Amino acid sequence: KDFGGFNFSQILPDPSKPSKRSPIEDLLFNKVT
Amino acid sequence: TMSLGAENSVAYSNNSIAIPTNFTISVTTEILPVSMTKTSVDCTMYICG
Ligand SMILES: *[C@@H]1O[C@H](CO)[C@@H](O[C@@H]2O[C@H](CO)[C@@H](O)[C@H](O)[C@H]2NC(C)=O)[C@H](O)[C@H]1NC(C)=O
Ligand SMILES: *[C@@H]1O[C@H](CO)[C@@H](O[C@@H]2O[C@H](CO)[C@@H](O)[C@H](O)[C@H]2NC(C)=O)[C@H](O)[C@H]1NC(C)=O
Ligand SMILES: *[C@@H]1O[C@H](CO)[C@@H](O[C@@H]2O[C@H](CO)[C@@H](O)[C@H](O)[C@H]2NC(C)=O)[C@H](O)[C@H]1NC(C)=O
């Protein structure tokens, strides 16, 4: 992830999560009931 | 289970670029409805004749 100093971890999919969602997407899915 | 698309991994690196050397003139069709059939119903004739 060498993008010239730009960080996209919050929007790229998280390998740790089984759903393969981003942290922002995971937060969005959690906040909808 | 459906396949979303063919897999393509873009070869990203910090110092390489891809430049097109040719072009294709592509003509595509787009169909859009504009109007419907103009229908009028005589309410008295329809319900009672
Ligand atoms: C990009 O951003 C992520 C998250 O904002 C950074 O990950 C953090 O790294 C620090 C240092 O190890 C940890 O203490 C945090 O817990 C991490 N956050 C998360 C959410 O895991 C990451 O270091 C940044 N830089 C790069 C190059 O990825
Ligand atoms: C530009 O160079 C890259 C890396 O040398 C090429 O990417 C490779 O393409 C082949 C053919 O599909 C793949 O088998 C490799 O896995 C690719 N490498 C990576 C790191 O993704 C790329 O095809 C080249 N561009 C052109 C137009 O030839
Ligand atoms: C760019 O692409 C066009 C395709 O449209 C190439 O034109 C073809 O060239 C070959 C070789 O001379 C001919 O056999 C074909 O009949 C041509 N096709 C058409 C539609 O004319 C063109 O040569 C390409 N140019 C480069 C620089 O790659």
**Dist CA A3 CA A11 (whole Å):** 14
Q: Which residues lie below 8 Å from residue A11, measured CB to CB, with a gap of 6+?
A: A22, A24
B43: part of which helix (H) or strand (E)?
A: helix B43-48
- The residue whose CA has the least distance to atom 26 of ligand 2 is B18
A23: helix, strand or coil: helix
Per DSSP, helices labelled H in A1-33 are 23-31
- Quoted resolution (Å): 3.3
**Dist CA B30 CA B36 (whole Å):** 18
- The residue whose CA has the least distance to atom 10 of ligand 2 is B11
**Dist CA A33 CA B5 (whole Å):** 31
Q: What is the DSSP string of B4-32?
A: -S--------TT-----------------
Of A1, A24, A29, give the one whose Cα is nearest residue A14: A24
Give the method used: cryo-EM
Burial class (CB in 10 A: 0-12, 13-18, 19+), A22: middle
Side-chain-facing half-sphere of A27: CA atoms under 13 Å? 5
- Give the mutation target among A9, A11, A22 for probing the ligand 1 site: most ligand atoms within 8 A of CB: A9
